[PDB]
């Protein structure tokens, strides 16, 4: 016996929380259809009355509608899902007053799960945009075809940034290894006007090419060690956690 | 029990704001059809009268018409769609006056 709680606007709509160890009491009258509200994504397996002909049962996905059909319909309705078993005590009210148009179920655990993820999302976004605790290397040299040069190059120990002017074509940037071989390196384009090419590596030497013009960028303060990436993201204030479990 | 509020040019057209925690009282007279007007982009799933025989039901897309088909037709109409679920307390008025030609919804 978990009596549902009527809504402040109207007494017809009632809310009670699911509990596996209790049955919910319903006060149904003649000629009204009660809307039993299920959780999103459940699986109706079966159901069972103690008196089938007393009530009329219509279901569509997660929407159960029940109305009385016979006199003195005092029985129960048990609905089993994939995740739990719903228990009702269908007591037929006799005056045709105070019906239950809907019975919405509140689930504590799903409330807690759904509310925490939004807080996590907001905190994670704020922590990416926080962007503190970074040292900036500005000891960068260049030599070559200056007409494809950036106006600024620097790195924060994790990525290297090349800032280009508004009127400059964005060139292609290549990773130069110890023997002088060039290879591809991933890049993302950042900045308010897409004027910064951030490459995902710190290297002693870079090569910039556009067409038939080449420019060499030199990191004159190359730190071989750098800051280790213990968090799995680009910032130390956000952590990448294994959701998949498995 | 949100009674809908009429327009200022005629009372035959009522309006109501949607509320998932309150029913809309519907006043039906004999021999009229009620155009219940749903929100755009809304897909009908299922409806369940209090009495299928006490009212006539017609639906084309998101338009709904209900019309009393029997005496003492005091029931409830619960139509459930993708976005929300509507509740109507259909109550037949015997005097054949003050009908509701259209019910139009508002959403906060």
């Amino acid at each position: 016996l978990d009596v549902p709680s009527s809504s402040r606007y109207d007494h017809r709509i009632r809310y009670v929380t699911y509990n596996p160890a209790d049955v919910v009491q319903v006060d149904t009258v003649l000629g009204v259809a009660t809307h039993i509200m299920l959780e999103e994504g459940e699986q109706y397996l079966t159901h069972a009355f103690g008196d089938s002909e007393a009530y009329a049962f219509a279901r569509k996905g997660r929407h159960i509608f029940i109305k009385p059909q016979a006199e003195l319909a005092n029985t129960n309705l048990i609905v089993v899902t994939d995740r739990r078993s719903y228990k009702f005590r269908l007591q037929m009210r006799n005056d045709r007053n105070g019906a239950m148009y809907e019975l919405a179920f509140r689930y504590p655990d799903t409330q807690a799960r759904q509310t925490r993820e939004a807080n996590a999302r907001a905190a994670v976004e704020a922590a990416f945009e926080q962007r503190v605790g970074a040292y900036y290397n500005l000891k960068y040299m260049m030599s070559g075809d200056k007409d494809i040069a950036p106006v600024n190059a620097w790195d924060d120990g994790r990525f290297t940034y090349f800032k280009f002017s508004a009127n400059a074509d964005l060139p292609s940037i290549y990773f130069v290894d110890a023997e002088g071989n060039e290879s591809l390196v991933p890049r993302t384009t950042v900045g308010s006007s897409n004027n910064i090419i951030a490459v995902h590596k710190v290297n002693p030497k870079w090569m910039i090419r556009l067409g038939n013009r080449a420019l060499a960028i030199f990191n004159e303060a190359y730190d071989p060690n750098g800051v280790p990436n213990d968090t799995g993201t680009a910032s130390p204030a956000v952590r990448r956690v294994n959701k998949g479990g498995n | 029990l949100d009674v809908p509020s009429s327009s200022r040019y005629d009372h035959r057209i009522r309006y109501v704001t949607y509320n998932p925690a309150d029913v809309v009282q519907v006043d039906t007279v004999l021999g009229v059809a009620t155009h219940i007007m749903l929100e755009e982009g809304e897909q009908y799933l299922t409806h369940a009268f209090g009495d299928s025989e006490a009212y006539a039901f017609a639906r084309k897309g998101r338009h709904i018409f209900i019309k009393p088909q029997a005496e003492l037709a005091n029931t409830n109409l619960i139509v459930v769609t993708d976005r929300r679920s509507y509740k109507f307390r259909l109550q037949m008025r015997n005097d054949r006056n003050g009908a509701m030609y259209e019910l139009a919804f508002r959403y906060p």
């Binding site: 003649l30 259809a33 016979a70 | 209090g50 009495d51 299928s52 029997a70 005496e71």
Partner: peptide, 19 residues
């Protein structure tokens, strides 16, 4: 059969959806 009695019989007989 008074109208209220016939109304009650109608209410008991009715299905959830006509059709």
């Amino acid at each position: 059969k008074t109208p209220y009695e016939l109304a009650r019989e109608r209410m008991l007989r009715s299905g959830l959806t006509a059709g």
